[PDB]
């Protein structure tokens, strides 16, 4: 009776949220951007092919210098690359080879990885001896590590398959904040540009906007049909895109609290593993399971281009801070740079 | 161009170490151990987070990964095991009430896009418990699988010496329930190797070695393009 009452109250509250979202949905983003010109045909070419990983790559993260990048692959290796010259700067052997995520610190002094070991491993790239060692092991998640992102050299938000996210102090090794509310495996997280908020997409077909310091879920975004494998903020921080297994990308707005746009096509039936915006946010680049990447016009929902350069599943995709390039890392053990 | 040459030398040394580690990795056979809690998957070869068991047969090194420390939802972390040589699926063949669950799990393994190229070594464990359940007669498979009432033992079946024919019909029926799923899809890319096993069995590492040998033969045949 109590549970039934709470479930009817919850249904009324979802109906109220849906009616508020419908009330604020006076027009759509397709109609408002109907009169602007198309971006044309975006034809990126492979400029650098980062070779050296010998198993499937699961994740990649550009450094803030827009030159160095870290890649995680399930040969047990974090490789840090000078993408300008294809020179490998670091090869970090991992204790657990089943790595699913990696992160480059904004300072460039640290990298993180993690996966089926349920541990966020922080490696110091600036040791006095000059060798990359384990600076910290962040145990405490009871599920696989699916995404991690540094805020600085001391705090990192991780997302996990235990349906939670966590803000960690690296110096103490402790979860300062636990972000709960997802009912499926949290596959990806994206930090806001001010690093005050972060969105997390999970396997409950939902994304959640969380306050990093206040610790609760401020907003919940639904509209996707299947597991959200990918999430990325719009560069102003007022919107974000999600990639899911329902073969669609969706642009949600924070202040409108609803989906603004769906990026899909009838010939696309495979899920999205990675999403990233360009520097202006006009291009939404998404990596797919049909071994290709699609550049979408983020304002007009038109497929602007196809990065068809991978013989296996595109698992990760990242855009440089200066917007110069896109790195797509795939299950064919290669990362490719495109512009 | 001195620090550039130093970076190139560092990258080539890193390439050398990566090549050596990749050859060492290419010599280890990666296996994914899957099974329910009652399956007895930990006692198969008898040798937190994901656990790794390293055993050796005929100088071939096998790393069998039992994925503990995760929730019951597996659709995302099992995609990590796209490139394993085989999935070792252990089933408690005596637990009839969960047999269909194991079958569904096998089906979800067999038909998954990122798992449809991976052969499965099927260990129908607890054959002694299955034998004493069949000889006891209290629990009937027809209460959980009505088609067992219409099932006959195959002519190709090789029963153990001193095995009761009802026990043979039961174990080969469970094997055929899994083989129906394995033969319904994915013909050519991956195969299911069934093995009847107890908990005292000590030849499961040899069975894994022979099945992995067959799997590697067929992958090398596809690489040669003979198959």
């Amino acid at each position, epitope marked *: 009776s109590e549970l039934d009452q709470l479930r009817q109250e919850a249904e009324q509250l979802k109906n109220q949220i849906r009616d508020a979202r419908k009330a604020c949905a006076d027009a759509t983003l397709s109609q408002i951007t109907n009169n602007i010109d198309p971006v044309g045909r975006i034809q990126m070419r492979t400029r650098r092919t980062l070779r050296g990983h010998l198993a499937k790559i699961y994740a990649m993260h550009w450094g803030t210098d827009s030159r160095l990048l870290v890649s995680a692959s399930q040969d047990g290796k974090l490789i840090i690359w000078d993408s300008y010259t294809t020179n490998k700067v670091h090869a970090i052997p991992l204790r657990s080879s089943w790595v699913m995520t990696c992160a480059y610190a904004p300072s460039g002094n640290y990298v993180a990885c993690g996966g089926l070991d349920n541990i966020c491993s922080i490696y110091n790239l600036k040791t006095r001896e000059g060798n990359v060692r384990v600076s910290r092991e962040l145990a405490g998640h009871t599920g696989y590590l699916s995404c991690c992102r540094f805020l600085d050299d001391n705090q990192i938000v991780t997302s996990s398959g235990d*349906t939670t996210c966590a803000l960690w102090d690296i110096e103490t090794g402790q979860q300062t904040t636990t972000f709960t509310g997802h009912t499926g495996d949290v596959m990806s997280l994206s930090l806001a540009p001010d690093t005050r908020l972060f969105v997390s997409g999970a396997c*409950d077909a939902s994304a959640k906007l969380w306050d990093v310091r206040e610790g609760m879920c401020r907003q919940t975004f639904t509209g996707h049909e299947s597991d959200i494998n990918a999430i990325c903020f719009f560069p102003n921080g007022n919107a974000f895109a999600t990639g899911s*297994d*329902d073969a669609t990308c969706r642009l949600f707005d924070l202040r409108a609290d609803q989906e603004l746009m769906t990026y899909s096509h009838d010939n696309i039936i495979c899920g999205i593993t990675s999403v990233s915006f360009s520097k202006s946010g006009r291009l939404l680049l998404a990596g797919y399971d049909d071994f290709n990447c699609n550049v979408w016009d983020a304002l007009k929902a038109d497929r602007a281009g196809v990065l068809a350069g991978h013989d296996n599943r595109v698992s990760c995709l990242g855009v440089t801070d200066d917007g110069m390039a896109v790195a797509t890392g795939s299950w064919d053990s290669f990362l490719k740079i495109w512009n | 161009s001195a620090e550039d040459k130093a970076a190139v030398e560092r990258s080539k040394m890193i390439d050398r170490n990566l090549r050596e580690d990749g050859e060492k990795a290419a010599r280890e056979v990666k296996l994914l151990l899957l099974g329910a809690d009652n399956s007895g998957k930990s006692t198969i070869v008898k040798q937190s987070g994901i656990f790794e068991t390293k055993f050796q047969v005929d100088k071939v090194n096998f790393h069998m990964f039992d994925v503990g420390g995760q929730r019951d*939802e597996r659709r995302k972390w099992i995609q990590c095991f796209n490139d394993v040589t085989a999935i070792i699926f252990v089933v408690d063949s005596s637990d009839y009430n969960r047999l*269909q669950e194991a079958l569904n799990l096998f089906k979800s393994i067999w*038909n*998954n896009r990122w*798992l449809r190229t991976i052969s499965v070594i099927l260990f129908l464990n607890k054959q002694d418990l299955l034998a004493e359940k069949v000889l006891a007669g209290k629990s009937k498979i027809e209460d959980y699988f009505p088609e067992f009432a219409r099932y006959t033992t195959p002519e190709d079946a090789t029963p153990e010496p001193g095995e009761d024919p009802r026990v043979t019909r039961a174990k080969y029926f469970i094997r055929d329930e899994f083989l129906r799923i394995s033969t319904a899809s994915g013909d050519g890319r991956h195969y299911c190797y069934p093995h009847f096993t107890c908990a005292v069995d000590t030849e499961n590492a040899r069975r894994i070695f022979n099945d992995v040998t067959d799997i590697i033969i067929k992958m090398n045949l596809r690489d040669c393009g003979l198959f």
Partner: nanobody
Amino acid sequence: QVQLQESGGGLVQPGGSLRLSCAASGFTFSNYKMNWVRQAPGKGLEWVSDISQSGASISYTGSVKGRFTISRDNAKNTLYLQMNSLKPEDTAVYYCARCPAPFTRDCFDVTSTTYAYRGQGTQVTVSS
């Protein structure tokens, strides 16, 4: 929002018949294989039946074969389970479970404790 709402359950005499319906919203119903799972008192989530995207591939667990009939109407986005010849071991909370990814034949995790593409379920009680 992916929503699965189940109805039709209730008290029913042994040997009686019941028709469970589920109304699906928030997803293209015809793109997913659909499931009926159930959870008896004191037991875990047990899979009962699946029906494919078109409605052609239909399978049941063996305890309900010949007694249960799964069907789908993709036009009204509704999943049906016709439960004839009901036994007291069919007393369970029945849940409509969508398979997690569209256009797939594998159906992972629909019997997991906290699976997301599953409704709140309806109680079917088979007692005299």
